[PDB]
RNA sequence: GGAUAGUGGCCUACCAUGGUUUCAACGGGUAACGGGGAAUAAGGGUUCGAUUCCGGAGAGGGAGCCUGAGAAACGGCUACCACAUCCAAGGAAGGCAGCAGGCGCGCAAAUUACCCAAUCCUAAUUCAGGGAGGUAGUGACAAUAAAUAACGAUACAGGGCCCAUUCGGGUCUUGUAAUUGGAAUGAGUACAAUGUAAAUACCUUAACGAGGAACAAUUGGAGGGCAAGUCUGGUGCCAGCAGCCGCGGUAAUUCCAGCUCCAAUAGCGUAUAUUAAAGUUGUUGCAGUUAAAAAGCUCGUAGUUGAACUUUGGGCCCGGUUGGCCG
């Protein structure tokens, strides 16, 4: 049990520190909507740092963001929605693929689903689901959750190692997203 | 395990308290008192669970602190104060005086006594000795030591106590023909006129008892408390008279008698 | 942590699962008494199993014994008040001779049909689980009720819940208003 | 006198004969030798999980002569290497090398489903995605 | 496969199509009424040739 | 309403809390639940005290409507009502104002920030204001 | 004698040679905290019990100690060992097997929520406090009850048969009826009210909410075991399928589909363990000529078992129950 813990630490020399470390994260909206800048906005409110100073309206698309609160440094990528091959060649490098979903507009059959399938057949390192609409609440005071069953239930049909789809419009939910990235 | 216990979970409460299995995890642990823990009864259980004068325990504190209520002429504002056998609970709500005495079924009862009878309690002597400066004193069953008793009083007799003071008026010798109240034991709360006693030098001296229906039975002597001569109780017996029944005649009474 | 809530399951599954007599003989009961599962038969086999156990132990005991007289008379009397056992058979030798059609005689689902005005035994059940029928001051919406033979002279439609009065409902509202009133513009 | 001693004070020899003759069953030997914790690559567990080393195929016993397409799993919790059967037809194309399969035995305490010479575990879930559902096309299998 | 559909909504307008899947036979009446439909097959009517019956016969 | 006819059953005169306590049996045919406020009118009128001497609570309605059973209280004075009755009920009856204490864990974090400073502590802020102001 | 709160090899000094054992010491192992209990239900047992209560033990590993009535106390301290944190490098600081969370590990386990309103506990104390406890979230661990449709008309085939003058209509029930009609509802939504510490939910209830593709029930099977198919096509060891027996070198009862049927039903199926079945653990209750098994024979200690025999009968009242013409 000490050899295994020793290898478990010797796995984690590469990703840990401000020196010799980087994670790669990709945010893909499975709708035409959302403009995934705001996914990083909602997701970096829970850093409690000055990493919200980067992500301005100034368009960078690759961010060497360190987070103080988890001692991790991330390389967040957003590809363009036009070039499909940019999307497939992004997660062909990535370590996480955060999928945006929507409460309002359905997942695109001819574009969005093809993103999920095609990433899913070229090989995903890891993958996390996200609801990010304000209208996850603003549409629905009609017992606001039930779209969560539609998007969890929809989202399992591709890769069923995912239990729940995280909301980024509440605090600790977004925190668990940030933890899980870090 | 590092010192005493402050708590007492339910399920470990003595069963004659008749608590509920639900509503909370903990039962009141009685404080140190005149009586043992296991055969006491706290005031909180006496009020909110027997008399239903209060609903919550917080209400019970609000009763006791406003003083309203007193065991043996003394105010006793503590909530888990362990009131016990043959104790006189005095309330100023409509001059109600309660004597905690047992039943057929072996539970403390709401047994209301008239105010003249509420003056005195009875007390089994547990030892008689000589104190410092060579003074004889008896120890009653619930802690009340008494200085200078009549030397006819020796162990396992009983003593009538004033409660205005610690003064004894009358005593009863422990002998055949005398009524006996059974406290503790399987046969708790039967009143039955001693046949005779066995000696057993070496412990646990049995006592033969014969009630008013010739249901003869035996308890150990530690569960014996004489309350008077034949048919002559010094206290007010509850409804039951220590005349424990069959289960078969309780379906005579309890569904055949009261019904139309 | 507070005291554990005690609980115990009711039905008892059969030991031989495909048995051509039982599979067919149960289903006649499912037909006449209108039960949704074979489990609803099994529950009755279990209640009957406990009365046959409790009766079977008392026959190992003697007459003029207080345990048999007491627990016996309580057993019998409890079965008489539910109308499972008839009146002349108060012996306790007979309570072994009961069977499942005696308990299923006394479900409220069938008491409403046998009672009258529920025409079928399926229509009766729908009348139960749809809040129509009552027992007394109380509404019952659960079929397996075991009407206790004194309450037979009380089963009726509810005060509320039409068939019983004061309202037409939903569908008669849409007809009588949103069609018949809809002829007015 | 029918072997055994029926004497009224002879309980000791009864229970010591019995304890000697309980090491005759198989299951009682399994329990008290702790064989489920020493051998038997699922370390006393129903299931396990492992990395697929490669995909194979069989030439099993007569009469049913065929190629039955088993695999090689190395378990995680032991480092043991045990062969494994993939269920409903197809589904060898669902697994790859170096994937994460969940194993469970056949239902014989080991040996066989039938003619299969020395394969005792079936695969229940690849990549957490449940071969029943893939075979019935209810979910999908992402790669790794 | 494609699940999301009109299971996004709890229900408002699911599938606004009066297009026949079957012709009044796409559904078994389930539950309590399915043991109504079996008591009316297994005891009201049907046999094959004499009593020892094939309950799922060859159609003829 | 529709002929409510409150019954007040299992009355116990309770002097040492100065109240009558009892179980409130409420018929209500053809109408819904009966709304405590309405009861405290309708039974202070028969206990002749005052509205705000009266507390009432519980009232789980019977299955399938038409009856509701709860537990009631009526005091002698509204003062001795207010000294014994729980503070949440008086908030329900308007006889008090819900005091705004903070969130629980927020208070606790204030409590653990006081263990780290000895005394009145004003000396410490009279020290940092020169040692870090230079 | 010391020591202890106190008996005591508890420890020192001196002295003696004892103490336990095959009625199994001692040693080893335990994937062993002990009980109250749990599972399995003819009886007798077997297997489990970390886990709501009682009792013990531990707070990373060992040791020591202060203070107190009570600690060898870890939400106290001291040292060492192993880990590991900040550092300006001089030093400083720590132990979730409390609660919630993480990370590893795994086949395998949820919220960094709300509140002291109950339950009780603590203090100088009705007031303050309490992740003790409660409330909600998650939760197909297990339990209980139980929706997915009920009824008419018309018409065809009946089985009856109304009075059997029946040769009147169908008393009364089945099906197929796309033939039809209303009638009743909840799941769901919602003003409200009750609920609550405040809320969500339940129990109530205005308003709204079935017509079939709808408000669409699965999971397993359809040779035998083990109830349901040789029906319709495909395929020809070809993969298959199969716990067991096996089906298909080709007119597949078993493979592949389509219908149809069965079984269980908001549940069902598989793995693993265990109990029953098992009279394959045997006390009740096995088997030992030939199927596994009688030791090569005799002696012989422990063990187990061991002939018979010692006031019997008769009077004599007292003496409670059961049963009865007696009532």
Curated annotation (Swiss-Prot), chain B:
UniProt-listed SUPFAM superfamilies: Alpha-L RNA-binding motif
- Where, per the database record, does this protein carry Phosphoserine? 31, 246
- Record has Cytoplasm as a keyword: yes
Can you tell me which residues the record assigns to a coiled coil?
A: none
Q: Where's it found, cell-wise?
A: Cytoplasm
Q: Which GO terms describe its cellular component?
A: 90S preribosome; cytoplasm; cytosol; cytosolic small ribosomal subunit
GO biological process terms, semicolon-separated: cytoplasmic translation; translation
Q: Please tell me whether the keyword Membrane is annotated for this protein.
A: no
Q: Which GO terms describe its molecular function?
A: RNA binding; rRNA binding; structural constituent of ribosome
The similarity comment for this entry is: Belongs to the eukaryotic ribosomal protein eS4 family.
Miscellaneous note, as given in the UniProt record, is: Present with 573 molecules/cell in log phase SD medium. There are 2 genes for eS4 in yeast.
Q: Please state what the protein is called.
A: Small ribosomal subunit protein eS4A
UniProtKB/Swiss-Prot annotation, chain C:
Signal peptide (from-to): none
One GO cellular component from the entry? cytosol
Sequence positions bearing Phosphoserine: 183
Q: How does it assemble?
A: Component of the small ribosomal subunit (SSU). Mature yeast ribosomes consist of a small (40S) and a large (60S) subunit. The 40S small subunit contains 1 molecule of ribosomal RNA (18S rRNA) and 33 different proteins (encoded by 57 genes). The large 60S subunit contains 3 rRNA molecules (25S, 5.8S and 5S rRNA) and 46 different proteins (encoded by 81 genes). Interacts with snoRNA U3. uS11 interacts with MPP10. Component of the ribosomal small subunit (SSU) processome composed of at least 40 protein subunits and snoRNA U3.
Q: Where is this region: Disordered?
A: 159-185
Q: What does this protein do?
A: Component of the ribosome, a large ribonucleoprotein complex responsible for the synthesis of proteins in the cell. The small ribosomal subunit (SSU) binds messenger RNAs (mRNAs) and translates the encoded message by selecting cognate aminoacyl-transfer RNA (tRNA) molecules. The large subunit (LSU) contains the ribosomal catalytic site termed the peptidyl transferase center (PTC), which catalyzes the formation of peptide bonds, thereby polymerizing the amino acids delivered by tRNAs into a polypeptide chain.
Kindly list the places in or outside the cell where this protein is found, as annotated in its UniProt entry.
Cytoplasm; Nucleus, Nucleolus
What protein am I looking at?
Small ribosomal subunit protein uS4A
Q: Entry's PROSITE patterns?
A: RIBOSOMAL_S4, S4
Q: What else is known?
A: Present with 106000 molecules/cell in log phase SD medium. There are 2 genes for uS4 in yeast.
Q: In this protein, which residues make up the domain named S4 RNA-binding?
A: 106-180
**Transmembrane ranges?**
none
UniProtKB/Swiss-Prot annotation, chain D:
Q: Which GO terms describe its cellular component?
A: cytosol; cytosolic small ribosomal subunit; ribosome
Describe the processing and modification events after translation: Hydroxylation at Pro-63 affects translation termination efficiency. The stereochemistry of the 3,4-dihydroxyproline has not yet been determined.
Q: Which BP terms in the Gene Ontology apply to this protein?
A: maintenance of translational fidelity; maturation of SSU-rRNA from tricistronic rRNA transcript (SSU-rRNA, 5.8S rRNA, LSU-rRNA); regulation of translational fidelity; translation
Please name the Pfam families in this protein's record: Ribosom_S12_S23
A GO MF term = structural constituent of ribosome
Cross-link annotation Glycyl lysine isopeptide (Lys-Gly) (interchain with G-Cter in ubiquitin), location: 55
Q: What's the reported outcome of changing residue 64 to A?
A: Lethal mutation
Query: Could you tell me the keywords of this UniProt record?
Result: Cytoplasm, Hydroxylation, Isopeptide bond, Ribonucleoprotein, Ribosomal protein, Ubl conjugation
Biological function? Component of the ribosome, a large ribonucleoprotein complex responsible for the synthesis of proteins in the cell. The small ribosomal subunit (SSU) binds messenger RNAs (mRNAs) and translates the encoded message by selecting cognate aminoacyl-transfer RNA (tRNA) molecules. The large subunit (LSU) contains the ribosomal catalytic site termed the peptidyl transferase center (PTC), which catalyzes the formation of peptide bonds, thereby polymerizing the amino acids delivered by tRNAs into a polypeptide chain.
Task: Share any extra remarks.
Answer: Present with 10600 molecules/cell in log phase SD medium. There are 2 genes for uS12 in yeast.
Q: Read off the NCBIfam families from this record.
A: PRK04211.1, uS12_E_A
List the protein's name.
Answer: Small ribosomal subunit protein uS12A
Q: Which gene encodes it?
A: RPS23A
UniProtKB/Swiss-Prot annotation, chain F:
Q: Where is this cross-link: Glycyl lysine isopeptide (Lys-Gly) (interchain with G-Cter in ubiquitin)?
A: 20
**One of the record's GO cellular component terms:** cytosolic small ribosomal subunit
> What keywords tag this UniProt record?
Acetylation, Cytoplasm, Isopeptide bond, Phosphoprotein, Ribonucleoprotein, Ribosomal protein, Ubl conjugation
A GO biological process held by the record: cytoplasmic translation
| Gene3D superfamilies named among the record's database cross-references | 3.30.70.3370
List localization entries.
Cytoplasm
Gene Ontology MF, one: structural constituent of ribosome
Pfam short name (any one): Ribosomal_S24e
Q: Where is this region: Disordered?
A: 101-134
User: Which residue stretches does the UniProt record annotate as biased composition, category Basic residues?
Assistant: 104-114, 123-134
Query: Where N-acetylserine occurs, residue numbers?
Result: 1
Q: Where are the transmembrane segments?
A: none
Residues the record lists as Phosphoserine modifications: 13, 55
Q: What does the PTM comment of the record read?
A: N-terminally acetylated by acetyltransferase NatA. Also partially acetylated by NatC.
The function of this protein is: Component of the ribosome, a large ribonucleoprotein complex responsible for the synthesis of proteins in the cell. The small ribosomal subunit (SSU) binds messenger RNAs (mRNAs) and translates the encoded message by selecting cognate aminoacyl-transfer RNA (tRNA) molecules. The large subunit (LSU) contains the ribosomal catalytic site termed the peptidyl transferase center (PTC), which catalyzes the formation of peptide bonds, thereby polymerizing the amino acids delivered by tRNAs into a polypeptide chain.
Q: Which family does it belong to?
A: Belongs to the eukaryotic ribosomal protein eS24 family.
Q: What else is known?
A: There are 2 genes for eS24 in yeast.
Identify this protein by name.
Answer: Small ribosomal subunit protein eS24A
- Tell me the organism: Saccharomyces cerevisiae (strain ATCC 204508 / S288c)
Q: What is the lineage of its organism?
A: Eukaryota, Fungi, Dikarya, Ascomycota, Saccharomycotina
Point out the gene that encodes the protein: RPS24A
């Amino acid at each position: 049990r000490a050899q295994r813990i020793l290898d478990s630490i010797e796995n984690r020399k590469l990703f840990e520190g401000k020196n010799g470390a980087a994670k790669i994260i990709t945010i893909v909206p499975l709708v035409n909507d959302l403009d995934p800048l705001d996914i990083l906005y909602k997701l970096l409110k829970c850093a409690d740092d000055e990493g919200i100073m980067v992500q301005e309206v100034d368009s960078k698309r690759i961010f060497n963001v360190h987070i103080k609160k988890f001692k991790s440094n991330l390389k967040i990528i957003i590809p363009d929605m036009t070039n499909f091959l940019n999307i497939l060649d992004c997660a062909k490098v990535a370590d996480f693929v955060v999928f945006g979903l929507s409460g309002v507009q359905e997942v695109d059959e001819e574009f969005g689903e093809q993103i999920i399938r095609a990433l899913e057949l070229q090989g995903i390192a890891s993958y996390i689901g996200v609801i990010s609409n304000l209208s996850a609440v603003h549409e629905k005071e009609k017992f606001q959750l039930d779209v969560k069953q539609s998007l969890e239930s929809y989202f399992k049909h591709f890769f069923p190692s995912e239990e729940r789809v995280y909301n980024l419009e509440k605090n600790s939910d977004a925190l668990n997203v940030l933890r899980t990235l870090c | 395990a590092r010192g005493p216990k402050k708590h007492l979970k339910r399920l470990a409460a003595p069963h004659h308290w008749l608590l509920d299995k639900l509503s909370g995890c903990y039962a009141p642990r009685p404080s140190a008192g005149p009586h043992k823990l296991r055969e006491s009864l706290p005031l909180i259980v006496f009020l909110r669970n027997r008399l239903k004068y209060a609903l919550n325990g917080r209400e019970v504190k609000a009763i006791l602190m406003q003083r309203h209520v007193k065991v043996d002429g003394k105010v006793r504002t503590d909530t888990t104060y362990p009131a016990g056998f043959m104790d006189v609970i005095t309330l100023d709500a409509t001059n109600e005086n309660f004597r905690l005495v047992y039943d057929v079924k072996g539970r403390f009862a709401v047994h209301r006594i008239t105010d003249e009878e509420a003056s005195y309690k009875l007390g089994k002597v547990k030892k008689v000795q000589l104190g410092k400066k060579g003074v004889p004193y008896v120890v009653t069953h619930d802690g009340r030591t008494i200085r200078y008793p009549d030397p006819n009083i020796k162990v396992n007799d009983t003593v009538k106590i004033d409660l205005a003071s610690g003064k004894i008026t009358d005593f009863i010798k422990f002998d055949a023909g005398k009524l006996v109240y059974v406290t503790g034991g399987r046969n708790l709360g039967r009143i039955g006129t001693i046949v005779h006693k066995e000696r057993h030098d070496g412990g646990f001296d049995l006592v033969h008892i014969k009630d008013s229906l010739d249901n003869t039975f035996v308890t150990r002597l530690n569960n014996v408390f004489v309350i008077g001569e034949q048919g002559k109780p010094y206290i007010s017996l509850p409804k039951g008279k220590g005349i424990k029944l069959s289960i078969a005649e309780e379906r005579d009474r309890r569904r055949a008698q009261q019904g139309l | 942590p507070r005291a554990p809530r005690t609980y115990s399951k009711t039905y008892s599954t059969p030991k031989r699962p495909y048995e051509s007599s039982r599979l067919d003989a149960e289903l006649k009961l499912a037909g006449e008494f209108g039960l949704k599962n074979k489990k609803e038969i099994y529950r009755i086999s279990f209640q009957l199993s406990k009365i046959r156990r409790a009766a079977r132990d008392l026959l190992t005991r003697d007459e003029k014994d207080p345990k048999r007289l007491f627990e016996g008379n309580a057993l019998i009397r409890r079965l008489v008040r539910v109308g499972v056992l008839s009146e002349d058979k108060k012996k306790l030798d007979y309570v072994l001779a009961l069977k499942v059609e005696d308990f299923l005689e006394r479900r409220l689902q069938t008491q409403v049909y046998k009672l009258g005005l529920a025409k079928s035994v399926h229509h009766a059940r729908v009348l139960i689980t749809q809040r129509h029928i009552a027992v007394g001051k109380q509404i019952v919406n659960i079929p397996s009720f075991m009407v206790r033979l004194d309450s037979e002279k009380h089963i009726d439609f509810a005060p509320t819940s039409p068939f019983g009065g004061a309202r037409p409902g939903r569908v008669a509202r849409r007809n009588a208003a949103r069609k018949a009133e809809a002829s007015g513009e | 006198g029918k072997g055994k001693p029926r004497g009224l004070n002879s309980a000791r020899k009864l229970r010591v004969h019995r304890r000697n003759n309980r090491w005759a069953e198989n299951n009682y030997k399994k329990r008290l030798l702790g064989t489920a914790f020493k051998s038997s690559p699922f370390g006393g567990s129903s299931h396990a999980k492992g990395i697929v080393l490669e995909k194979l195929g069989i030439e099993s016993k007569q009469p049913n002569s065929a190629i039955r397409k088993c695999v090689r799993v190395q378990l995680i919790k032991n480092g043991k290497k045990v062969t494994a059967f993939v269920p409903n037809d197809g589904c060898l194309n669902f697994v790859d090398e170096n994937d994460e399969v969940l194993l469970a035995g056949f239902g014989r305490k080991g040996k066989a489903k039938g003619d299969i010479p020395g394969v005792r575990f079936k695969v229940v879930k690849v990549s957490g995605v449940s071969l029943l559902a893939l075979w019935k096309e209810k979910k999908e299998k992402p790669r790794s | 496969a494609k699940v999301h559909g009109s299971l996004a909504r709890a229900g408002k307008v699911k599938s606004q199509t009066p297009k026949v899947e079957k012709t009044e036979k796409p559904k078994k009446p389930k539950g309590r009424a399915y043991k109504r439909l079996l008591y009316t097959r297994r005891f009201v009517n049907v046999t094959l040739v004499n009593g020892k019956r094939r309950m799922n016969p060859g159609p003829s | 309403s529709d002929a409510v006819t409150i019954r007040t059953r299992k009355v116990i005169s309770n002097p040492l809390l100065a109240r009558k306590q009892f179980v409130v049996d409420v018929l209500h045919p053809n109408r819904a639940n009966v709304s405590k406020d309405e009861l405290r009118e309708k039974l202070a009128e028969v206990y002749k005290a005052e509205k705000d001497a009266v507390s009432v609570f519980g009232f789980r309605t019977q299955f399938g409507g038409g009856k509701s059973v709860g537990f009631g209280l009526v005091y002698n004075s509204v003062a001795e009502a207010k000294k014994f009755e729980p503070t949440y009920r008086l908030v329900r009856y308007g006889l008090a104002e819900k005091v705004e204490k903070a969130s629980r864990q927020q208070r606790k974090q204030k409590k653990n920030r006081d263990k780290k400073i000895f005394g009145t502590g004003k000396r410490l802020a009279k020290k940092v204001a020169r040692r870090n102001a230079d």
